[PDB]
Amino acid sequence: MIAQGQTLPNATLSQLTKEGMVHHPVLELFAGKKVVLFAVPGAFTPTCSEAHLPGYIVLADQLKAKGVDLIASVSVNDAFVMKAWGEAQNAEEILMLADGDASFTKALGLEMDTAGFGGLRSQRYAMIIDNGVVTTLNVEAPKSFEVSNAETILAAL
Amino acid sequence: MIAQGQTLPNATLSQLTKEGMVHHPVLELFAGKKVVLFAVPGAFTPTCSEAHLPGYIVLADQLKAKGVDLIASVSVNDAFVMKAWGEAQNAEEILMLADGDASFTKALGLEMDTAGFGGLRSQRYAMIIDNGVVTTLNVEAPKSFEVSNAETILAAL
């Protein structure tokens, strides 16, 4: 998988705007910013709340107070589903990003096969990204109960 | 791995009673009964969407209504910890069983390595055991969001 100190893959993530589909080069979107990015295996799927959208929603103020410019949620889902999920969660403060063909996730080496559930999806992870460089990367290790969360990211700041 | 239709290996499970530590072959405990057995990776381990013991506690009367004689919970833990865990969850109904050296779990082929967390533990699974025969076996598959919860067992009944 990607290492700390490496620049993110020079790839895109998509978002639905009033302009239609926008494909953000992540290295442009995250340039000049301290960014918190977290991934889930799917929009609307269950994850310990502290480790995905609800956790980052309630910690958003504290994260921004410690210098985070942008908090973003990514998943192997399309941009319509990601928009709907943000709306359902009232994810005001969080940028919803779509990796619909799993290309960004595979470039990170953080894909996983869910077989009949949903095909290839993302592992759960969270990053602090400084000007496009991965500074902190925490990846779920479910068999050993490595129970990292938004607080883990807050403390890394 | 043990399979549906097979009879349990007569491996030992332990308990703490007024005699202190005691142990019995599992068929001494389960013969002549319809038993629901729920296994976890560890006592006091958290759940978010996975099956959990309080789910069996809430459905205990409905399980018994459908012919279950005994609801039991097993883990690779010792009997003092299993007793404490049962008390913490107000699980006086449920029989708390200890597989302290993982011999029962290994006999079933349902072990998993948790490495630095807790060494060798059990996968999360549930069984319906009719006079020693595993008539239903549901093993969790977290990557596909398949859970071995009490409702799954209730539907199998």
Numbering used by the authors:
A (entry chain A), B (entry chain B): 1 to 157
What's the publication's text?
V. vulnificus Prx3 (VvPrx3) belongs to the 1-Cys class of Prxs, with one conserved catalytic cysteine (Cys48), and has been shown to be involved in pathogenicity in a mouse model. Cys48 is the CP residue that is crucial for the function of the protein. All three crystal structures of VvPrx3 revealed a protomer exhibiting a compact and spherical structure without a C-terminal extension region, similar to the previously reported 1-Cys Prx AhpE from Mycobacterium tuberculosis. All three crystal structures of VvPrx3 [reduced Prx3 (C48D/C73S), oxidized Prx3 (C73S) and H2O2-bound Prx3 (C48D/C73S)] showed a similar dimeric assembly in the crystals characterized by an A-type dimeric interface, similar to that in AhpE from M. tuberculosis.
To focus on the function of Cys48 and prevent unwanted disulfide-bond formation at Cys73 during SDS–PAGE analyses, Cys73 was replaced with a serine residue in this study. To investigate an oxidized structure of Prx3 containing a disulfide bond, the crystal of the oxidized VvPrx3 (C73S) protein was obtained under crystallization conditions without a reducing agent. The crystal structure of VvPrx3 (C73S) [named oxidized Prx (C73S) in this study] was determined at 1.5 Å resolution in space group P212121 using the molecular replacement method. The A-type dimer in the reduced state is further linked by the disulfide bond between the CP residues at the C-type interface, which can lead to the linear oligomer observed in oxidized Prx3 (C73S) crystals.
